[PDB]
């Protein structure tokens, strides 16, 4: 079974602005699920997680990115919203695993990652995500932006051993408001 990962950013206030300006000074809405993907063993058998994949569902905005260190994150448009987009981080919730961009250079391996635990006793991977919103129109209107519930990735598993079937799941952004002055 797999639990959806729904990141929950807090309300934002933005006081202006070139495209690519982040709405907040760092990432927000960090959220994690204990049971990201868990394989269900058949009776008297053993199962483990071999690989997890994430496919970002959004449309990239050409030429706009979110930078952290040597990492360059794509920025996507938000269905229903003009002038604000998002970047996101998604990873194995292992303390040895860093956040790095997916969907760069269709789907992306997210497990194993560098630092992940990998053995036949890993029947469960926990997942963690976060988001940042980015100005994409240099003429962003002032007012109240209501970001709708937005699925941002579909995810799925490849399990090993004797299991009851692979899972699919999602990553989504919970609705949030950005007040632009």
From TrEMBL:
Compartments, record wording: Fimbrium
GO cellular component, one term: pilus
Disulfide bonds: 39-47
Primary localization class, coarse: other
GO biological process, one term: cell adhesion involved in single-species biofilm formation
Keyword entries, A-Z: Fimbrium, Signal
Record-stated family: Belongs to the fimbrial protein family.
Protein name (database record): Fimbrial adhesin
């Amino acid at each position: 079974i797999a639990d959806p990962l729904v990141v929950t950013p807090p309300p934002m206030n933005f006081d202006g602005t070139p495209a690519g300006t982040p709405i907040t000074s760092t990432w927000i809405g960090e959220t994690s699920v204990h049971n990201g993907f868990k394989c269900e063993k058949k009776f008297l058998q053993k199962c483990w997680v071999e690989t997890l994949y994430a496919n970002a569902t959004g449309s990239k905005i050409s030429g706009i990115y979110y930078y952290e260190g040597s990492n360059r994150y794509p920025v996507y448009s938000l269905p229903g919203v003009k002038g604000i987009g998002y970047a996101f981080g998604l990873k194995d919730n292992n303390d040895s695993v860093a956040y790095v961009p997916i969907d760069v250079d269709g789907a992306t391996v997210i497990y194993p990652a560098v630092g992940s635990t990998v053995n036949h006793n890993v029947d469960r991977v926990s997942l963690k995500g976060k988001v940042v919103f980015v100005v994409t129109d240099k003429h962003l209107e002032t007012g109240v932006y209501n970001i709708p519930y937005t699925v941002i990735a579909n995810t799925w598993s490849e399990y090993g051993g004797g299991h009851k079937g692979n899972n699919t799941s999602i990553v989504a952004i919970n609705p949030v408001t950005i007040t632009a002055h």
